[model samples]
Target chain A: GRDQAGITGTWYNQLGSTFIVTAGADGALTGTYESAVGMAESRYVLTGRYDSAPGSGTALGWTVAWKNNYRNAHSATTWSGQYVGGAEARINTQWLLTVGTTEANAWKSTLVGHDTFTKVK
Target chain B: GRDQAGITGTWYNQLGSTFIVTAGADGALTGTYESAVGMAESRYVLTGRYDSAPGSGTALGWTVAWKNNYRNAHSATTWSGQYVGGAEARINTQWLLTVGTTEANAWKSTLVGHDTFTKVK
Candidate 1:
């Protein structure tokens, strides 16, 4: 079945940043992420959901969301992607962060990256 | 002069994808890019501009757009990045593609990747 678990596993970026994702049968997607580059090392805890495409064809569409947690910074990302067959996939995501430590205002950034995952036990 | 040329050079990702950027004195940014992990070989032609942070406090930002050409597929990317000092920089980018052969509508994807350049003459 094409569900949230379709994206469950460990994914990494070109910089070796890690995204550890777990998708429940109920479509709840949660993860922990860490970047390899930056002034300081930080770990982010994220919670979100996924929506998978319904049909079987060359195009498999999916979307995901995550409420991201990092230091005193509050952020989130919305992802839209497609399964390019095999174990390869790509996602286009947008990240929004609260500008001030305690403000409701935000700053927006966009990202376009690929994802490669291997089912690991 | 804190102009677009600050980013002129050859940049690479962890996967060996390459970006050759040329920042003009007038602040116009142009480049060519290629990926190493796809089924087909393709090159992207890009164009856009850059905006540097006002002071030397540690934040540098820039954005780019491209007209990507790949096996009869039409696509483009917009990149937002920050200079992390030295030869390392990072960009949060967005990729948009024309879904059909001649469709005006598009499909979008996001990528967050880092760049490393050696000041080669």
Candidate 2:
């Protein structure tokens, strides 16, 4: 079941990453991304689309480009997932982060992970 | 000709919207979108990729979802363009904003425009 506004508010990922998302009636999703474990810990931005309205939709997609930390010159991650509403709102997502470069050696420069983001106040 | 770092800063579009972009060496683009007009005029999120590093690259792409103000059910805009570096750094972009439903009636719910985003301090 969809909540009145499921995908809005602050969420914390398993890795301690903080995500603040805002959903528009037009299905536009935008917000902030702050990481806690890397050089990219600085505040960043995020943009994507969502499917929610008067009733919080169940699915959404979004992306955030990790700041260029001390390790890699460039990299970014895309997340696609669902919003489970209840006493404890949850977001289950699978993300793919492309590190360094996307080339023949990309297989080694890629990371795949899943996160259960818990809604914060 | 890429500059030391060009796309890291604030920019204002022709329509007066403000865009604060942070591009990482990893080619990930992230930022904030603050509109100066309409009901959707609020701080939003943006995520995308760029081609810049030691030197600011020329091309980049990004997207932002408009807040559901007094508008349709859902809408978003995508910008693809070149970053011209010089005394006055400029981001010349062609944007397509999809309003409402993307379907047979989409032609009436779409807006195509261009903007020369001037870099701000």
Candidate 3:
């Protein structure tokens, strides 16, 4: 099911180094990254709750907020598209910029923005 | 890509003068028309099918089903929409109706509809 694109949760990215970011109801998200040295540019408002139990460590699966050229750039307003799919994200999750009518389009335009989550302690 | 609607077959229409009500397979569509006078109301149960034969006879490049507030409306029903693109026909051909949120919208929506069919017999 699709939900409204409101800042109602938290998210984090973990490839080599990781970080955490907090967001508000209107999508005002700010956080930190472990390695900003080689951080490339891409756009994706990925969000999902973090699950860390007694020994589960930390794993956050984000849902897609929007994508480019899908249903005609509808990702920006469609509720059903407010979350990301693990399969979809993983398949196209390379920290790079792209253009044209391919998955790279999302990397460039659709959901064209994300933040590096830094634990605020 | 999405397929699953019913009421398949031919359709006919005229610019200002049209009359149709001939339908089988539960399509129940008929026919007749002229000019200056419209055929039906804004409401529709539009159907499809018919690949043209020859002459100024017809140039129907039709292939659509329903439209409007769209899957969110379903005019004739609540759980299911009326007889039109993505509705009257299979969801697969709906691209002609909704046109994927592009210019394809108005053009194709105008396609499968009967009032614009051009011929009577």
Which scores greater on lDDT, model 1 or model 3? 1
What tens digits encode model 1's per-residue C-alpha lDDT throughout A1-121? 2645556777665446676777666656677766563321456665666554444422222232332333443233343444333454533343322222222211113333344333331
Question: Tens digit of lDDT per residue, candidate 1, span B1-121?
Answer: 2635557777666456677777666656677776554332666666666654332422333333333444533333344544333553444343332223222211123333344333332
List the RMSD of every prediction in angstroms: 17.3, 9.5, 16.7
Q: Score every model by TM-score.
A: 0.37, 0.50, 0.21
Mark the 10 consecutive residues where model 3 chain A has the least summed lDDT: A89-98
Q: Give a tens-digit lDDT track for model 3, residues B1-121.
A: 1111122333333223232434333223333212232222333343433322221221122222233332322112111122334322221111111223343222111111222331222
Q: What digit string (tens of lDDT, one per residue) describes model 2 on residues A1-121?
A: 1232777889999888898988776556678878876557566667666545422324455666554343333545556555666777777665555444323453364455667799763
lDDT of 2 by residue, B1-121 (tens): 1332678788998878999878776565667888776556567767666544423325455766554444423545666555667777777665555444323453364455667799763
**Candidate 3, residue A95: CA error in Å?**
26
Poorest lDDT segment (10 consecutive residues) of candidate 3 chain B: B72-81
Docking quality tier of model 2:
incorrect
Q: Model 1 residue B4 lDDT?
A: 52
Q: In model 3, where do residues sit more than 4 Å from their true spots?
A: A1-79, A85-87, A90-121, B1-19, B25-80, B83-121
For all candidates in order, the CA lDDT equals 0.46, 0.61, 0.28
Report the interface RMSD that candidate 2 achieves against the true structure, in angstroms: 7.4
Question: Which regions of candidate 1 fall more than 4 Å away from where they truly are?
Answer: A1-121, B1-5, B39-42, B52-70, B87-121
User: Which residue window of length 10 is worst by lDDT in model 1 chain A?
Assistant: A99-108
TM-score of chain B of each: 0.57, 0.81, 0.19
**lDDT by residue for model 3 over A1-121, one digit each (tens)?**
1112222233333333343445433333344323222322334344444332211223333443334232222333111112333322211122211223354232123212233332221
